[PDB]
Write a protein that binds this DNA or RNA. Structure first.
Length: 74
DNA sequence: GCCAACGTTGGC
DNA sequence: GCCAACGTTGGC
């Protein structure tokens, strides 16, 4: 399900066609650490909430969006 | 001390 | 030149 790692999955809190992936680091000091990426319907990768906001503009209100889980968490 | 957010780099 | 992957750090 939603906490499964290494697998792109639907993010239903965003507009249609957005997906999310959790990727675990392998090499280097920061190994094991978990990061989250988003993919637009066009397939571009997004690495931060501010980056999503810049791209989505007023088509979404991300004010309560939790980047790590992809849920709206008021 | 942490980590959100971003900059840099190696490998292609 | 691209981009996955790691390193870096200002703001908290």
């Amino acid at each position: 399900g939603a906490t499964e790692s290494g697998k792109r999955m639907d993010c239903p809190a965003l507009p249609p066609g957005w997906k999310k992936e959790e990727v675990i680091r392998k090499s280097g000091l920061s190994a094991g650490k978990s990061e989250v990426y988003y993919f637009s319907p066009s397939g571009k990768k997004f690495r931060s909430k501010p980056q999503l906001a810049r791209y989505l503009g007023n088509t979404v209100d991300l004010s309560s969006f939790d980047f790590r889980t992809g849920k709206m968490m008021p």
